[PDB]
Design a protein around this ligand. Structure first.
Ligand SMILES: [Mg+2]
Ligand SMILES: [Mg+2]
Ligand SMILES: [Mg+2]
Ligand SMILES: [Mg+2]
Ligand SMILES: [Mg+2]
Ligand SMILES: [Mg+2]
Ligand SMILES: [Mg+2]
Ligand SMILES: [Mg+2]
Ligand SMILES: [Mg+2]
Ligand SMILES: [Mg+2]
Ligand SMILES: [Mg+2]
Ligand SMILES: [Mg+2]
Ligand SMILES: [Mg+2]
Ligand SMILES: [Mg+2]
Ligand SMILES: [Mg+2]
Ligand SMILES: [Mg+2]
Ligand SMILES: [Mg+2]
Ligand SMILES: [Mg+2]
Ligand SMILES: [Mg+2]
Ligand SMILES: [Mg+2]
Ligand SMILES: [Mg+2]
Ligand SMILES: [Mg+2]
Ligand SMILES: [Mg+2]
Ligand SMILES: [Mg+2]
Ligand SMILES: [Mg+2]
Ligand SMILES: [Mg+2]
Ligand SMILES: [Mn+2]
Ligand SMILES: [Mn+2]
Ligand SMILES: [Mn+2]
Ligand SMILES: [Mn+2]
Ligand SMILES: [Mn+2]
Ligand SMILES: [Mn+2]
Ligand SMILES: [Mn+2]
Ligand SMILES: [Mn+2]
Ligand SMILES: [Mn+2]
Ligand SMILES: [Mn+2]
Ligand SMILES: [Mn+2]
Ligand SMILES: [Mn+2]
Ligand SMILES: [Mn+2]
Ligand SMILES: [Mn+2]
Ligand SMILES: [Mn+2]
Ligand SMILES: [Mn+2]
Ligand SMILES: [Mn+2]
Ligand SMILES: [Mn+2]
Ligand SMILES: [Mn+2]
Ligand SMILES: [Mn+2]
Ligand SMILES: [Mn+2]
Lengths: 36, 215, 145, 157
RNA sequence: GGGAUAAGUGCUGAAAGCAUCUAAGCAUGAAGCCCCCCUCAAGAUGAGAUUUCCCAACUUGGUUAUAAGAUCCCUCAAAG
RNA sequence: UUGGCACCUCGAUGUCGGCUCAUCGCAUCCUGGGGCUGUAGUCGGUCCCAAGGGUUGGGCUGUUCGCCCAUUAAAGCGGUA
RNA sequence: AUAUGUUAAGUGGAAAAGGAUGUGGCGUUGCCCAGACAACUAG
């Protein structure tokens, strides 16, 4: 997961969710994941 | 798991089947007898108390430790043994095989058995830092007035004490040391001697406790 | 110096009580017991002497925590050796030796003065449900409020 | 079939086996029930919806259990045993031990075709998550333990 | 070797008919965290345990020698 | 770090570099665990966890730096007057 | 202590641009049993 302060969906397949108390991207593309 | 007490007699060479030259320490274990069975029942934990070398007479009315005192008399007499001069526990024995009155004998250690050996470590006196922690000396020459002193002992005004770890001069020789993994090389049942591969920490005549290796 | 009772060692009696931690919050059982221990509960309270009663806290194991702190509340300790801090223990204290979790926790609510010290030595905490001290014949006591 | 025990809403299914916790503090309905959408009060609606979901997932597999299938897309493939699948998988230089009898878990052997064969989807999902854990689907020549019907993206050497 | 964990990988899962490692609940996972390994350690005043040893004369609580047991002193060293 | 300010010390708070001894932080040089990869393999890049331990001998210069010779798994960065 | 609500971060008990279906209130609106959101079947 790219680890960044900002979190937005990357592409129109992406979905945002909290998972440990942390907001995270779920784009399904292996090189498009995120977790603030 | 097994163990015996023994007096370190000293070092020799001995020869392997391959001509291999194996340094050996000669441990001697005449006369060890089990003296007490320590069960969880009474003692709270499991141990066999073995009494090493034999010592004199009775509550005989005299100066030395060589002669046993009434407390020892009664302790040995509960075990139908003559009074002994060294006594130690081994926890981590088989605690059930071992009935109280019996001898342990050298024959319990079989050749090629790998073992750990405890014993207190020779004895240097009050000693300087270079001898006791190996610390490099200061330069000689080049105008130095520093040779065998332990270094800076601390910080400036921040660590404004000397930290509790600090290492400096004093007594060297105490401290029990055990050394791990040494082969039994031979066992000489005729004189109760038992040969140990390598060197065990004693001075000489030091009591050492051999026990079955852990790990 | 008109009138003002001060309790002597002649003029004072010390009762024994048993407390069931099972079902209680750590801090609340702790503070209630501390006042019990200081005698701050009798009308004959007097500051320069140990006026308190004995407390045996029971089933220390069943003590509880409020927050998400079975894991989040660490106890530290330092060995006075360099870098020998010891973070260890959380509500792991309640797992092994909770007798100390309750003991030290209660004792941190008594004054650090030799009197307060003797006062702390009047507590007895057992994780199990069976004190040795039956001979002192403790009365069962219910947590107020 | 339609047989299940009850007490304190922690009751075993009568067929085969069960035992499970409830979150308690919730509205409950007999047989199939419903209302995954809302119940009781507040945003505890989520929790109760998970309760109905869990018990429903429980009853759904007790008569006809669901079983994940795992295919070994490589030149090596696991054999079989009465308590293990004997995963001599991929080409790591040793066979691995695996499997457990907990609840009910069947073996499988079909030349690179294996299956967990449990009851509830949680135990199956677990033992197969780990049966598939031993080697992974490396996305080139697609090799590796693979859940059946899994997307397996690839790329160019 | 065992236990718990991080980043991570997940399972089951609603909120949010789907989907989702997570909020309930589960599994996995590091030279690191705990136990294991080595030495110290009951002045742990919270002063622990086991085995053995000794055992009265006087008393207006105590008194005094003694016992088990040591030590002083003396010959010493593996100790200093 | 270079500074700004002039609050402690002018009836004195020794000062660069080295040497001796270290101790701590993590923004990790190596080693352990992973994600992405424009990751085939062998290597690597980059981020994430991790501070247990380790982290070299010389040529020139007072030097700290720096260049260089030769090795290393690596030749980490800072605090502690 | 009382009454009514909030907060689940030990926030309380250090910090910004920026970021998030975290929850609470107060409003305004467009599609809704003429069937809509979502899911599944047909280009
Ligand atoms: Mg970052
Ligand atoms: Mg996690
Ligand atoms: Mg000398
Ligand atoms: Mg709790
Ligand atoms: Mg205990
Ligand atoms: Mg103080
Ligand atoms: Mg567990
Ligand atoms: Mg003492
Ligand atoms: Mg006492
Ligand atoms: Mg003592
Ligand atoms: Mg003399
Ligand atoms: Mg030094
Ligand atoms: Mg970086
Ligand atoms: Mg480190
Ligand atoms: Mg160290
Ligand atoms: Mg160099
Ligand atoms: Mg070179
Ligand atoms: Mg490498
Ligand atoms: Mg350098
Ligand atoms: Mg440094
Ligand atoms: Mg604070
Ligand atoms: Mg600004
Ligand atoms: Mg803010
Ligand atoms: Mg809002
Ligand atoms: Mg709102
Ligand atoms: Mg309107
Ligand atoms: Mn040197
Ligand atoms: Mn001088
Ligand atoms: Mn000199
Ligand atoms: Mn100085
Ligand atoms: Mn584990
Ligand atoms: Mn679902
Ligand atoms: Mn004692
Ligand atoms: Mn009398
Ligand atoms: Mn005598
Ligand atoms: Mn001699
Ligand atoms: Mn400055
Ligand atoms: Mn000034
Ligand atoms: Mn001014
Ligand atoms: Mn002065
Ligand atoms: Mn001065
Ligand atoms: Mn870090
Ligand atoms: Mn790595
Ligand atoms: Mn370091
Ligand atoms: Mn309220
Ligand atoms: Mn805070
Ligand atoms: Mn903002």
């Amino acid at each position: 997961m790219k680890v960044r302060p900002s979190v937005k969906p990357i592409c129109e397949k992406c979905k945002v969710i909290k998972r440990k108390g942390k907001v995270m991207v779920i784009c399904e593309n292996p090189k498009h994941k995120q977790r603030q | 798991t097994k163990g015996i007490l023994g007096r370190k007699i000293g070092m020799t060479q001995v020869f392997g089947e391959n001509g291999e030259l194996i340094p050996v320490t000669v441990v001697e274990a005449k006369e060890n007898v089990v003296l007490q069975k320590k069960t969880v029942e009474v003692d709270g934990y499991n141990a066999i108390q073995v009494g090493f070398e034999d010592k004199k007479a009775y509550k005989k009315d005299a100066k030395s430790n060589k002669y046993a005192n009434k407390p020892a008399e009664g302790h040995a007499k509960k075990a139908d043994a003559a009074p002994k001069r060294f006594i130690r526990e081994f926890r981590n024995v088989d605690v059930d095989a071992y009935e109280v009155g019996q001898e342990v004998s050298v024959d319990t250690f079989v050749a090629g058995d790998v073992i750990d050996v405890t014993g207190v470590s020779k004895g240097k006196g009050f000693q300087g830092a270079i001898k006791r922690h190996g610390q490099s000396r200061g330069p000689m020459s080049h105008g130095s007035h520093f040779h065998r002193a332990p270094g800076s002992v601390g910080m400036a005004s921040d660590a404004s004490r000397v930290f509790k770890g600090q290492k400096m001069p004093g007594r060297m020789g105490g401290n029990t040391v055990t050394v791990q993994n040494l082969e039994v090389v031979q066992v000489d049942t005729e004189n109760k001697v038992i040969l140990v591969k390598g060197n065990v920490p004693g001075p000489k005549k030091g009591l050492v406790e051999i026990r079955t290796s852990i790990k | 110096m008109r009138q003002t009772f001060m309790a002597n060692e002649s003029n004072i009696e010390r009762k024994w009580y048993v407390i069931d931690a099972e079902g209680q919050t750590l801090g609340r059982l702790s503070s209630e017991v501390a006042s019990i221990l200081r005698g701050k509960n009798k009308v004959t309270y007097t500051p320069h002497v140990d006026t308190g009663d004995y407390v045996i806290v029971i089933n220390a194991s069943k003590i509880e925590f409020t927050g998400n702190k079975e894991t989040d509340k660490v106890y530290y300790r330092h060995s006075n050796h360099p870098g020998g801090i010891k973070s260890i223990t959380a509500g792991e204290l309640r797992r092994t030796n909770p007798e100390r979790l309750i003991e030290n926790s209660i004792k941190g609510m008594l004054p650090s003065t030799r009197l307060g010290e003797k006062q702390g030595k009047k507590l007895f905490v057992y994780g199990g449900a069976e004190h040795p001290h039956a001979a002192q014949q403790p009365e069962n006591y219910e947590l107020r409020g | 079939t339609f047989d299940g025990n009850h007490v304190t809403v922690k009751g075993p299914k009568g067929e085969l086996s069960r035992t499970l916790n409830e979150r308690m503090t919730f509205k409950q309905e007999e047989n199939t029930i419903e209302v995954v959408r809302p119940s009781d009060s507040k945003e505890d609606r989520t929790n109760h919806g998970t309760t109905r979901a869990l018990l429903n997932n429980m009853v759904q597999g007790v008569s006809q259990g669901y079983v994940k299938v795992l295919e070994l897309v490589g030149v090596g493939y696991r054999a079989q045993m009465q308590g293990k699948d004997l995963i001599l998988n991929v080409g790591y230089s040793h066979p691995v031990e695996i499997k457990a009898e907990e609840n009910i878990t069947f073996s499988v052997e079909k030349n690179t075709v294996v299956k967990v064969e449990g009851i509830s989807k949680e135990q199956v999902g677990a033992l197969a998550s780990n049966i598939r854990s031993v080697r992974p689907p490396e996305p080139y020549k697609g090799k590796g333990i693979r859940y059946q019907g899994e997307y397996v993206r690839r790329k160019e050497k």
